Ligand binder design. Structure first.
Ligand SMILES: [Zn+2]
Ligand SMILES: [Zn+2]
Ligand SMILES: [Zn+2]
Lengths: 306, 452, 116, 46, 66
């Protein structure tokens, strides 16, 4: 009926994928997930005539756009599109609507891999995934305002591989993406490949935006996971149930300790979550000097007769 | 309409013909688009897995808010022969059509396509300068032929025989003119993609010869939908049957082959327009005094305006016309009903009557909030005049047939009258007058009832 | 004290009236606030919520006293605990991190890229 | 407990499960409160 | 709170991915072996059953009690 937009956020990190390769019994798992993504994009473009596809990778040294290709294509030596430098990666008897998009994205994949190999000497401690789906929502709104309507949806191809834990800098931008996606009613679908069973922030992202979370552990047969569950278009979202069996608690980590929080305290100025009363009677975040009376009232003992 | 029309056409296709039709990946990809999105989702979920899935899993997949949509999709896919229902272990096991599944997987995974999508020869021009106006000219040729305006270029005899065998476009050669039916202006109601669809379903209803099969026609039209405009394609993949329809729609203008028997055929923009869609021209202005001010410059819009509006003048912007009684009589003698003309006026109304219409609806709701009225974009005076003209066309109505009278016994009259009423051919009856009339179509049935 | 000018400026007054007002420097209400994080209980049996005494299938069990409520963010009507979600404080983080305005580049200087 | 055993012999256990499960969470909450009261009482005793 | 790998094998894994991209990707290799498909389908259907049983039932609702 109404066409949609399939925006996809790919998490490419050499350390994460290679630790998945080492933990797994196979090498070259990203080729498998790449071709699974390609046939997913072909399935999405087969779903409707007018639906569109965006794919964005979040590499170590930043983010780059994979489809649609950057507008520097000028039918020149640096065009890098269509028959210009058309290196034979996929077969030429493909459907041309599929052929153009798949060939362009795999050329951009190889170009990103060349650029990341050229900067293999520097190891980034910062993950660019949160800014990646931030720009994904930005392009979603670009398509929504340019084309009048059209639905939209996000897919997240993330990987933990038991090496990267749940980071602290990935708290605020993820919920900014959650509220933005809730504003444009864009579902957020997340599949996590790796040994780490639970990713709490992404679980809340799927739950709060009417999306689906599915953690996976084997690179084989992932298109069953994708085209079985990740294909719920926004046209039929309310009439299809979700396989998101994992139940998230919508909790948070404490600031000065880091553990998952229970009934506790916050600063009434900087509003960070504290499992216990911080030392020095001052905030660890905004250095707000606290009244001794109120923390005496919170340190006050409950009463029972002798 | 469009999706329902092609679905009902492909319902008429036999199951073995449908299974032979599912061979090419282009046909499977085209019919995949014609499924409902719930049906499309379930089919593509069933595509990649060789194991067969019970119907209870698909039923549990759907929320209770879309149970009716799920049942409608099940009806559509069962009628489309895409499911093999299997009875095993007390369960109605469901299996996808294997040829359809294989061809669709090849269309997705880049498998065997047997050049169903054509081949590019990398010699091509821009569509706007050569292809687009050729397609527009070839479409407007048959349009301006069928509306009846004189032309210097007339189409080929094939489309003439197609229109003659069609329900619309009744023809007479002893008079020297081509009569437009109601179905003709009904064809002019919808937008050109569904016009092309109705044209091609009438074509397939026409072509029953041994010279042409069916699966090749469907393959060719679905790959024409699959082709892209601005790149030529080689004629070698088509069969000689598909080549003679390549010539046939080259005459139509769906495809531009620059010369006959050439090896390069250029798809026109109508080929992509056929699959799915995407102040305007033809936006008209009507007043209380039946005046016509049309923001139109295409000859086809004002040509079809000429059938029911007495045109007085034509600017580079306007076509000065007036809704006279005689123009409406010209419309109604063609079978063109008044409500369809009213709908045409509503769809082609200028946005200024739209803003004044929402203004007067705001006045109506602020004056009488207890009742709501539909948005009359055009004033009801002209609509009432058109309805009065329609009614005065048929002030008396003349139903022809036969009448039985002269019954000496009331029981014979009553039995014949109730027999006529039961078969729904009686128009009047009374035992006092001892007469009852039956229609012309019901004459022979009652005559053989009385003879036996 | 704001006075509107036209129809749209009134909605402007509302949507900058939704913003949190900056507090003065002399205001010292720098306190800690005790509140807990309830968990969404899941049950096919409807149960009496502590706020309304009505049968609600869902609910949020209070971490302090294990009492269910209908909506969040609401106080717990058993132990007076401000039951919340991470989403409710999440909606309020962004005021504490206001984005600096994006400075449009000069047209004379060499642009970084052709696309955004 | 009186209401639990009144529907035990009143409706003959066919409704007693529903009556127990309906009032289960508030019973658990007040049981937790009494447990905390007794725990603090023993804490002051110790 | 409630594996470190070096750049050499990064480079060899990168080269393996790049020449595996260069030579061929058969897109039909994503089709399961009809065995893992059954297990993953069972997982998906069980998750669907659990979510549908929970979300089947969710003004107060009518009760069987008088
Ligand atoms: Zn603070
Ligand atoms: Zn309540
Ligand atoms: Zn409580």
């Amino acid at each position: 009926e109404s066409p949609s937009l399939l925006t996809v956020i790919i998490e490419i990190a050499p350390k994460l994928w290679t630790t998945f390769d080492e933990e797994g019994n196979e090498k070259g798992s990203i080729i498998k997930v790449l071709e699974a993504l390609i046939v997913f994009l072909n399935a999405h473009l087969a779903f409707n005539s007018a639906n569109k596809v965006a794919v964005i990778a979040a590499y170590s040294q930043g983010i780059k756009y994979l489809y649609p290709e950057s507008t520097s294509a000028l039918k020149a030596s640096e065009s890098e599109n269509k028959t210009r430098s058309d290196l034979k990666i996929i077969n030429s008897d493909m459907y041309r609507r599929f052929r153009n998009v798949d060939e362009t994205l795999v050329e951009e994949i190889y170009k990103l891999f060349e650029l990341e190999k050229k900067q293999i000497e520097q190891n980034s401690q910062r993950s660019t995934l949160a800014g990646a789906m931030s720009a994904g929502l930005t392009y979603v709104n670009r398509i929504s305002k340019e084309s009048v309507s059209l639905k939209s949806r996000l897919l997240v191809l993330t990987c933990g591989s038991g090496s990267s834990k749940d980071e602290i800098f990935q708290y605020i931008p993820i919920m900014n993406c959650i509220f933005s996606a809730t504003k444009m009613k864009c579902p957020i679908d997340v599949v996590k490949i790796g040994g780490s069973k639970e990713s709490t922030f992404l679980q809340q992202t799927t739950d709060a935006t009417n999306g689906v979370y599915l953690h996976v552990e084997s690179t084989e047969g992932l298109i069953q996971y994708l085209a079985t569950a990740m294909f719920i278009d926004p046209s039929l979202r309310p009439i299809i149930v979700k396989p998101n069996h994992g139940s998230v608690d919508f909790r948070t980590s404490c600031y000065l300790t880091g553990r998952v929080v229970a009934v506790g305290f916050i600063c009434s100025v900087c509003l960070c979550v504290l499992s216990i009363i911080p030392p020095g009677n001052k905030c660890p975040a905004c250095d707000s000097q606290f009244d001794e009376h109120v923390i005496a009232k919170l340190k006050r003992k409950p009463v029972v007769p002798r | 309409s469009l999706k329902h029309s092609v679905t009902q056409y492909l319902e008429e296709i036999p199951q073995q013909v449908q299974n032979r039709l599912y061979t090419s990946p282009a046909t499977c990809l085209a019919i995949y688009r014609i499924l409902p999105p719930l049906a499309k989702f379930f089919i593509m979920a069933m595509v990649f897995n060789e194991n067969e899935v019970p119907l209870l899993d698909l039923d549990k997949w759907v929320n209770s808010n879309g149970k009716l949509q799920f049942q409608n999709a099940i009806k559509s896919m069962k009628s489309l022969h895409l499911l093999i229902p299997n009875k095993s272990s007390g369960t109605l096991m469901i299996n996808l059509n294997p040829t359809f599944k294989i061809s669709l997987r090849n269309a997705l995974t880049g498998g065997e396509v047997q050049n169903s999508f054509g081949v590019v020869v990398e010699e091509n021009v821009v569509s706007l300068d050569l292809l687009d106006e050729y397609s527009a000219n070839k479409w407007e040729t048959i349009l301006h032929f069928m509306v009846g305006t004189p032309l210097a270029k007339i189409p080929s005899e094939k489309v003439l025989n197609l229109l003659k065998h069609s329900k619309l476009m009744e023809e007479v050669n002893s008079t020297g003119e081509f009569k437009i039916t109601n179905e003709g202006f009904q064809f002019l109601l919808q937008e050109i993609n569904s016009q092309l669809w109705t044209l091609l379903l009438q074509y397939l209803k026409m072509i029953e010869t041994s010279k042409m099969d069916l699966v090749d026609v469907l393959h060719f039209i679905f790959m024409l939908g699959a082709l892209e405009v601005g790149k030529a394609y080689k004629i070698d993949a088509l069969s000689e049957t598909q080549r003679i329809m390549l010539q046939d729609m080259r005459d139509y203008g769906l495809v531009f082959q620059k010369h006959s028997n050439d090896s390069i055929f250029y798809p026109t923009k109508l080929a992509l327009m056929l699959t799915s869609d995407t102040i305007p021209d033809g936006s008209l202005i009507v007043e209380t005094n039946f005046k016509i001010y049309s923001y139109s410059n295409s000859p086809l819009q004002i040509a079809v305006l000429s059938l029911f509006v007495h045109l007085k003048a034509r600017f580079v912007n306007m076509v000065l016309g007036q809704i006279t009684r005689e123009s409406i009589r010209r419309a109604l003698t063609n079978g063109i009903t008044a409500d369809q003309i009213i709908a045409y006026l509503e769809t082609h109304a200028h946005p200024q009557m739209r803003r004044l219409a929402e203004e007067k609806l705001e006045k109506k709701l602020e004056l009488d909030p207890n009742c709501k009225e539909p948005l009359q974009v055009l004033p009801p005076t002209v609509v009432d005049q058109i309805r009065l003209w329609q009614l005065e066309l048929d002030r008396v109505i003349t139903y022809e047939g036969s009448l039985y009278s002269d019954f000496e016994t009331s029981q014979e009259y009553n039995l014949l009258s109730k027999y006529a009423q039961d078969i729904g051919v009686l128009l009047w009856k009374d035992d006092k007058k001892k007469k009852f009339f039956i229609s012309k179509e019901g004459n022979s049935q009652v005559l053989d009832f009385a003879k036996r | 004290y704001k006075i509107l000018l036209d129809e749209t400026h009134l909605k402007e007054l509302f949507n900058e009236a939704v913003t949190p007002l900056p507090v003065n420097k002399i205001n010292k209400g720098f306190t800690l606030v005790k509140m807990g994080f309830p968990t969404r209980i899941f049950e096919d049996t409807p149960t009496f919520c502590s706020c309304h005494s009505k049968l609600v299938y869902g609910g949020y069990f209070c971490p302090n006293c294990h009492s269910k409520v209908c909506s969040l963010p609401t106080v717990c009507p058993c132990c007076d605990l401000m039951l919340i979600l991470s989403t409710h404080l999440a909606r309020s983080y962004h005021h504490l991190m206001p984005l600096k305005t994006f400075a449009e580049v000069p047209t004379t200087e060499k642009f970084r890229s052709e696309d955004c | 407990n009186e209401l639990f055993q009144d529907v035990l012999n009143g409706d003959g256990e066919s409704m007693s499960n529903t009556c127990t499960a309906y009032l289960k969470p508030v019973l658990n909450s007040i049981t937790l409160a009494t447990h905390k009261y007794d725990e603090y009482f023993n804490e002051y005793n110790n | 709170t409630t594996l470190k790998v070096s750049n050499q094998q990064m480079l060899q894994q990168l080269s393996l991915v790049m020449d595996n991209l260069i030579n061929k990707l058969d897109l039909n290799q994503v089709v399961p072996n009809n065995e893992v498909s059954n297990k993953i389908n069972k997982r998906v259907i069980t998750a669907i059953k659990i979510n549908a049983k929970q979300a089947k039932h969710n003004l107060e609702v009518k009760s069987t009690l008088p």
